[PDB]
Each structure stands twice: as C-alpha cells, then as structure tokens.
C-alpha cells in the first residue's frame, strides 16, 4: 500500500473480468454446489443425521448464494466457527481493516478466498460431512473425460524411461523434453492433443513435434523456460552439492495434477531433480484445486478399469497406466515425491507474505523452507494472482516489481500461468494493445479480456536475488 503500489482489482471495477466473475460466476458455482449435493444425496439413505445435516447445508448454500446476489456486507467468522472449522484468524483481521465491505465492492482476491471459506465452514460444522468435498464429483468427471490424453502421456513416460536413465548417467534432446513437460504442465487440460500425441522420442524430435511446440509457444507471451532450464542443468552438473529440490505450488486436480506429476517424474528420472515437494490446499477450494486426498484419488483412478477403460490389463494402455501409478507410489515411499498441505495457501494472503515478515499465518515458516528449494514452480492463475497481489499493475510492469519481496528474499521461482484474470504484467511494449485490438473484434467492449480467456499463457522466472 505504498504511494506507487496499485490497488487490487475489485468486484466493483467497471468492465473487468473480476466484476463479471463476482456478479455472474460465483452464484453459478454455489448453485452448482447445491445441485451436486442433491445428486450425492440420491446415492444414500433418505433420512437420519447425515441426511438432515445435508438438507441444512443446502438451505445455507441457497441463502449464501442470495447474499452474494444481494451484495450484502461480508460478515466475520464467529468464535464458534473459528474453533469448529479451524478458520485462520486472518479473515477477521482483514474485515476489521475493511469495515462494512460488501460483495458488490470488495477486493476480488479476498472475497473469492472468503467465498470458499464460508462454504467450508458449513461442511465442517456437520460431523457427517466434515471431510466431504462438494467439488469432487466435478473433479472426477473432468478427469474421467481426459482418458485419451492420460493414456498418451502414460505411454510417453514408459517409452522415455530407458532414455531418461541414460541421460541421468551423463543434452539438447533433454532440453526439448524439458520444454514439452513444462508446457504440458502449463496448459493442463487445455493441452492440445498435438503435443500429447507424440509419445516417442522420435515423434517428439520430428517435424510434427517441432510444429506442436511452436504452436504452444506462440501463445506463451512471456517465456522464461530457458532460465529454469539453466538453473536445473547447472545444479545437476554441480558436483559439490547433490540434493536438487523442486517444489510445486499446485492448482487443479486431475489432468493438471497428472501433468505436474509427469514433470516431476521426468525431472527425477533425468537427474534434473532429486526431491520434489508438492504443496496442496487443506480445504475444498476454487472448485478444482488439489487437496492431499486428490493425489490418492488420481492414483486409484489410473488403476481403475471402469474409470479409465484401457481394456484388459495386458493392453499397452493398461500397462502404461499401471506403471505410472506404481512409480508414483514408489516415489512417495522413498520420499522422492512428498505431498504437504498448509492453511496458508487457503488464507486470503498474497505471496508478498511468503516473507520473513509474516509471523502469524505460516508465511515466514513456508518462506524459510522454500528458500532451500532449487526451484519453486507456482502453477496456475490463482497462484499468479497471489504472486502479483492481484493489483492493477501496468501490463508492462517488470516481473520483479510485481512480486515485491519475492524478487529479493531468496526464493527461486517459476510461475506457469494460463492467463485467466485481469492482472497481467511483464508484457513487451505494445503487446497488450495488439492482443486487445484483435480480441475486441469478437468480444466488443472486452478487448482487455484476452488475458482472461485462458488462450494465452506466461512462464515467468525470478532468481530471488
Ligand atoms: Mg484451480
């Protein structure tokens, strides 16, 4: 909040995608939760404590949706709620500093995080529902529909595995693979089959492979992939220190999580990493965002021949899915892959609080540990919003400026972000004008929303020094 620090995007900022999100998408998400709760009830006993508790949650969700529609003031969490649902104290502190804010004129970042907190308090109050994930039906459904791409990537892992081992025993072929797995991780479900369909080293190196990468990369308007490459290849070559730690601050479950696992597996098998740590959400959050249990659901899905019908176990497809699931379990057992959750990730705090200054809500604890990482990969749009504080930076703002203390407090970071929100920085001169003018043609009055569409992406690096 300094003189030259821009304000955060607000639900009241006229013509922004945040304004549209709050007035239009949020009541849909809550209504979807009511409907999914109804769908779940179909599959169980129609009376008793669990049933009644769920009817009450549905009523409360209905009223909550209407509160957002009526643009009422955001109420604090009661002491009872804080204790039963383990609500961080940060929310009530925020509301004291922002008295009487209402859904119609409130910071987009805080209110969105608050939304999922209010939803979770309803579930945590109800003992038969305290661990239920109201977004899980959707998470599973979306992943189920990714069958084709899932099998293609599993086949690729299995194919590459001997060559990755030889690489580890020693390449610009390794560089091509690095770009592929980074970009597949970046695009998540949106990954075009053109990238995935090349499942052998030969196909990846081929003209077809090159064209697929060039198509992906033409949409990545800031691309610091080479800087991260630099970091991991130098650490691998460094014979003084052996540990190479890579962290993943995660976004969505399912295919995006699968691709992050695939990137981790690739780094581990090639020697570009020796330990990968995954950071997940501790409550159902932003609809699809990974929780610890979503990893185990993914591994179970991979082996589930009703879920992913890869045919008899003997098929190549079934063998490849089973191999990857087994590799995951193996890496978790040996500690090459480790999953963690933390309440910090589901507070309203932006990542300028990933700093020694943040002594109340774990920011300083996480920061001290992340300093030890060779590379912290932040996935997705929400993490990017928290890196940049979700502020109205000019769209050419230097990346180091937008991330505040993260430019200088010893965390080496890489943001992989599909652009799905108004905030956008580090663009070349003139690019925002160019993309806006093209976008404006089919989206009148909304030219600036090119970076809200998910069609463009950025890959942004900072050494933290
Ligand atoms: Mg997400």
Q: Is 417 helix (H, G, I), strand (E, B) or coil?
A: strand
Tokens 């082996």 sit on residue: 303
User: Is 399 in contact with 221 (CB distance < 8 Å)?
Assistant: no
Q: What is the spatial distance between Cα 323 and Cα 235, in angstroms, rounded to a whole number?
A: 28
Q: What is the spatial distance between Cα 81 and Cα 60, in angstroms, rounded to a whole number?
A: 14
Q: What is the spatial distance between Cα 285 and Cα 253, in angstroms, rounded to a whole number?
A: 11
CA 287 to ligand 1 center in whole angstroms: 7
Q: What is the spatial distance between Cα 151 and Cα 196, in angstroms, rounded to a whole number?
A: 9
Phi, psi of 130 (to 5 degrees): -65, -30
Paired tokens of 325 = 């699931």
Question: Longest Cα pair distance anywhere in the chain, in angstroms?
Answer: 65
Q: List, as residue ranges, the binding site.
A: 25, 112, 251-252, 289, 381-385, 420
The DSSP call for residue 250 is: -
Among 436, 413, 441, smallest CA distance to 424 is for 436
User: Is 216 in contact with 195 (CB distance < 8 Å)?
Assistant: yes
Q: What is the spatial distance between Cα 319 and Cα 155, in angstroms, rounded to a whole number?
A: 9
Among 430, 422, 420, 350, smallest CA distance to 393 is for 422
Write down the domain spans for the chain: 1-12+133-465, 13-132
CA 377 to ligand 1 center in whole angstroms: 15
Q: Is 342 helix (H, G, I), strand (E, B) or coil?
A: coil
Q: What is the β-pairing status of strands 245-249 and 275-280?
A: parallel
Paired tokens of 82 = 């804080």
Q: Which residues, 6 or more positions from 441, have their beta carbon under 8 angstroms from its beta carbon?
A: none
Strands of 71-226, DSSP E: 220-223
Among 182, 178, 142, 141, smallest CA distance to 160 is for 178
CA 252 to ligand 1 center in whole angstroms: 4
CA 381 to ligand 1 center in whole angstroms: 7
Q: What is the spatial distance between Cα 107 and Cα 188, in angstroms, rounded to a whole number?
A: 28
Phi, psi of 281 (to 5 degrees): -85, 150
What is the total residue count of the chain? 465
What number does CATH give the domain 13-132?
1.20.930.60
Q: Is 281 helix (H, G, I), strand (E, B) or coil?
A: strand
Tokens 């940060």 sit on residue: 90
β-pair partners for 245: 275
CA 371 to ligand 1 center in whole angstroms: 25
CA 386 to ligand 1 center in whole angstroms: 13
CA 258 to ligand 1 center in whole angstroms: 14
How many CA within 13 A on the CB side of residue 49?
6
Q: List, as residue ranges, the binding site for Mn(2+).
A: 251-252, 289
User: Is 254 in contact with 288 (CB distance < 8 Å)?
Assistant: yes
Q: Is 17 helix (H, G, I), strand (E, B) or coil?
A: helix
User: Is 298 in contact with 150 (CB distance < 8 Å)?
Assistant: no
Q: Which residues, 6 or more positions from 320, have their beta carbon under 8 angstroms from its beta carbon?
A: 151, 154, 155, 157, 158, 310
Rounded to the nearest 5 degrees, what angle is found at the Cα of 140, between the Cα atoms of 137 and 144? 135
CA 89 to ligand 1 center in whole angstroms: 24
Q: What is the β-pairing status of strands 275-280 and 220-223?
A: unpaired
Q: H or E stretch including 160?
A: helix 147-169
Q: List, as residue ranges, the binding site for substrate.
A: 25, 112, 251-252, 381-385, 420
Q: What is the spatial distance between Cα 237 and Cα 375, in angstroms, rounded to a whole number?
A: 16
Q: What is the spatial distance between Cα 432 and Cα 448, in angstroms, rounded to a whole number?
A: 8
Q: What is the spatial distance between Cα 457 and Cα 426, in angstroms, rounded to a whole number?
A: 12
User: Could you tell me the sign of the dihedral formed by the alpha carbons of 229, 199, 288, 336, in that order?
Assistant: negative
Say which experimental method was used: X-ray
Phi, psi of 434 (to 5 degrees): -70, -50
CA 279 to ligand 1 center in whole angstroms: 13
User: Is 321 in contact with 304 (CB distance < 8 Å)?
Assistant: no
Paired tokens of 130 = 């305290």
CA 465 to ligand 1 center in whole angstroms: 29
CA 17 to ligand 1 center in whole angstroms: 16
Q: Which residues, 6 or more positions from 2, have their beta carbon under 8 angstroms from its beta carbon?
A: none
Q: What is the spatial distance between Cα 177 and Cα 199, in angstroms, rounded to a whole number?
A: 11
Q: What is the CA radius of gyration of the chain?
A: 22
């Amino acid at each position: 909040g300094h003189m030259t620090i821009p304000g955060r995007f607000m639900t009241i900022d006229k013509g922004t995608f945040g304004e549209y999100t709050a007035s239009t998408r949020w009541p849909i998400i809550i209504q979807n939760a009511i409907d999914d709760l109804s769908k779940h009830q179909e599959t169980e006993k129609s009376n008793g404590t669990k049933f009644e508790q769920g009817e009450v949650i549905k009523k409360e969700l209905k009223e909550f949706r209407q509160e957002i529609i009526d643009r009422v003031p955001l109420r604090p969490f009661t002491e009872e709620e804080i204790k039963i649902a383990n609500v961080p104290l940060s929310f009530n502190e925020y509301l004291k500093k922002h008295p009487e804010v209402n859904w119609g004129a409130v910071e987009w970042l805080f209110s969105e995080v608050y939304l999922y907190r209010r939803v979770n308090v309803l579930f945590q109050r109800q003992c038969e529902w305290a661990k239920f994930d109201i977004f899980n039906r959707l998470k599973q459904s979306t992943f189920e529909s990714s069958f084709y791409g899932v099998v293609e990537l599993a086949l690729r892992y299995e194919n590459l595995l001997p060559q990755l081992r030889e690489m580890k025993q020693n390449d610009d072929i390794l560089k091509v693979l690095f770009k592929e797995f980074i970009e597949i991780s970046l695009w998540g479900n949106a990954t075009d089959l053109s990238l995935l369909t090349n499942a052998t080293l030969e196909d990846i190196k081929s003209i077809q492979g090159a064209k697929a990468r060039a198509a992906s990369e033409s949409k990545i308007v800031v691309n610091d992939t080479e800087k991260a490459w630099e970091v991991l290849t130098k650490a691998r070559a460094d014979a003084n220190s052996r540990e190479i730690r890579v962290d993943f601050v995660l976004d969505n479950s399912g295919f995006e999580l699968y691709a992050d696992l695939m990137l981790a597996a690739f780094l581990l098998q090639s020697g570009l990493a020796t330990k990968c740590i995954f950071h997940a959400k501790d409550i159902p959050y932003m609809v699809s965002d990974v929780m610890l249990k979503d990893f185990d659901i993914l591994v179970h899905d991979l082996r589930d021949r009703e879920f992913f019908p890869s045919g008899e176990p003997s098929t190549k497809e079934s063998r490849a899915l089973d191999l990857f699931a087994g590799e995951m379990e193996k890496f978790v057992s040996s500690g090459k892959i480790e999953f963690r959750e933390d309440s910090f990730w589901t507070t309203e705090l932006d990542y300028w609080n990933l700093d020694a200054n943040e002594t109340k809500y774990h920011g300083s604890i996480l920061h001290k540990d992340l300093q030890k990482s060779n590379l912290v990969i932040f996935k997705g749009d929400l993490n990017y919003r928290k890196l940049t504080g979700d502020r109205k930076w000019p769209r050419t703002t230097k990346w180091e400026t937008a991330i505040g203390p993260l430019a200088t407090n010893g965390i080496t970071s890489l943001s992989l972000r599909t652009c799905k929100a108004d905030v956008q920085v580090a663009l070349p001169e003139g690019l925002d004008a160019k993309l806006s003018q093209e976008w404006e043609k089919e989206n009148p009055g909304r030219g600036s929303w090119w970076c809200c569409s998910g069609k463009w992406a950025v890959i942004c690096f900072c050494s933290g020094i």
